[PDB]
Design a protein around this ligand. Sequence first.
Ligand SMILES: Nc1ncnc2c1ncn2[C@@H]1O[C@H](COP(=O)(O)OP(=O)(O)O)[C@@H](O)[C@H]1O
Ligand SMILES: [Mg+2]
Length: 713
Amino acid sequence: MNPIHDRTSDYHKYLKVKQGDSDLFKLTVSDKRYIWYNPDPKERDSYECGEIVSETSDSFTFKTVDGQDRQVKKDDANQRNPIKFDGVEDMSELSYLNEPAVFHNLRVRYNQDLIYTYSGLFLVAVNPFKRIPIYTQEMVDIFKGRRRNEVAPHIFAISDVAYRSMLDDRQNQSLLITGESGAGKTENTKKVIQYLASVAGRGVLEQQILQANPILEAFGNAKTTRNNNSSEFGKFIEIQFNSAGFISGASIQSYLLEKSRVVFQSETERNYHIFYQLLAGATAEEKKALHLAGPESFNYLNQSGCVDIKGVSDSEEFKITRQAMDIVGFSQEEQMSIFKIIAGILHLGNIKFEKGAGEGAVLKDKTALNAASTVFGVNPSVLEKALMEPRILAGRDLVAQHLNVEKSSSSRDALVKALYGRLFLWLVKKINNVLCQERKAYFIGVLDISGFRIFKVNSFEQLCINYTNEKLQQFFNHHMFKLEQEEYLKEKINWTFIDFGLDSQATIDLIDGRQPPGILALLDEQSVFPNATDNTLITKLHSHFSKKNAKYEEPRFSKTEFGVTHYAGQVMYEIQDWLEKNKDPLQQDLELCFKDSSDNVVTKLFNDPNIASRAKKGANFITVAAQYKEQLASLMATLETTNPHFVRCIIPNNKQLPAKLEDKVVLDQLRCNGVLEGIRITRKGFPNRIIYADFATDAVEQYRFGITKIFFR
Ligand SMILES: Nc1ncnc2c1ncn2[C@@H]1O[C@H](COP(=O)(O)OP(=O)(O)O)[C@@H](O)[C@H]1O
Ligand SMILES: [Mg+2]
């Protein structure tokens, strides 16, 4: 029996709306009309349901839950959909398209653990914050080759749609999985990968593809206050296919790894999972060879007050990371070198610099220095001198510096951050060498980049993330609205342009523009100006955009911050240390020291130009901002060669709790993601177009005859 029609199947139980009872039936056939209203107009996102009792030509009168009658203009009314629409799988079918109506549909579904809902062309996924048995091989098999309209909403169905369009249209595809921290991006990304591996698999290559994310998560994920498994890097995964539709390989591109987490963590947060995994999972032999101890013995792990995650066994995770490495193809020697680098970083963090005779730092206790030098295979006396007494050129003269405690400690942190970043780049390169071994015919790209963020402190790293999200929103806007209307106006179907009110260009230009120069261009200019400070930088920004740019704000409450109005709201950025972050400096004597390592992996991190080198940009190296703008432009160009599909992950609350869908939290995300605007284009427009020579020309309202095609709703 077909599980799609079997009321006893797990498909029906977990993916379909439960059969309503005779009491619900009686309510459903009622001719009564209702309105969604705010009992307190100071709380716009808090709604109640009121019955319409009377009407005039331009108004409705309704009874409140309290009993009192209120009047609302028909133009201002948010009518409640007939209850037969409650739980509808595609919200473009709703009679009334409004904020409480959309929220209420999502709520009815969520109360039944139905996390997936369509909003016209795209998928909405509300995080359940609990396990739902809808990702089995049995579920995969049900979704295989079914049309979107034939099955319930699911991450598997949007993945199958992308796969079929790739075969039928001979076009590359993309699945853009977006949302704020902890919304569910990474979980849904993994479901896309699992699905494609199964429906397009032949498998050794498929198993290795499935083992790529567990390796990268051990090194790129950490417990933050918003997510126990927060991704601290963005990723673009290309699943590669041959002409026949079989997976021929995969490619991974990583973005914005949060390197400062290695040296500093906020209270309750953790460093990268790998540090805890190695300390809990190492064999007694490994612990002796790498000079390991408990996380409380390392400065890089004993500052937050948190060394474990509830329900996570770090030693068991370590076995999973090690098995993922074995499957992918990392040798035991390469794995041991990877663990020596992690061990070495922890030892480097324990180096305590002290003031010596007069100005200049000394190292009184060499235990941590020697432990780091042993695992790294470097000379400890050369390491010591490179940290406290690095040599530089003053003109053409060779001068030994003598760094004080603060500068010595900052140089040591720069080395740690360089080691970790370079190791992460190396892991991605090693994974790609295995998974990308054929020339692809087509691809399905899965994008999982860091979500839009408004933290208490927003710095350069938050600007790069929010800028990326701003580019993605514009891409969504262009594909959903602009390009769609441009097709209607070119085909001459007598279309009246709709201003959807979404425009990210001014914010994008404010950040990455060249003429007039944007934030990044001004930061790069200041980064090469010898006398630049945090003060000259903020003054330069204020001079260029204050009272000149509608998206920019010079705050009255601070002298070191500026505001940017993003699609997802205003963000105040602090500029402290942006010059140093943009230069990302590392003392050349440290590079020389590590280039001379006895370790084969450490050597690659300092000698492979594609990992170690910084692009040549004349007088000075390329800045981090210029490098990132370029890497992002390249991502956008790849995305523009694809047919895109959007998955909007919605966090239900800010407490990481299941069964607690919060009005204010969800409605704020729906407004940012353009969910209502997205449903309006699907309803008001002509989503499907087929030519007469693609099936007198009419051969027969809800259609439009165009110049070269017939449009239908
Ligand atoms: N579909 C889902 N099913 C079960 N748990 C989920 C699901 N999506 C998210 N979660 C839970 O929420 C957490 C955060 O999800 P995640 O994908 O890591 O978010 P993001 O990448 O958006 O920051 C997960 O670790 C898991 O506990
Ligand atoms: Mg994630």
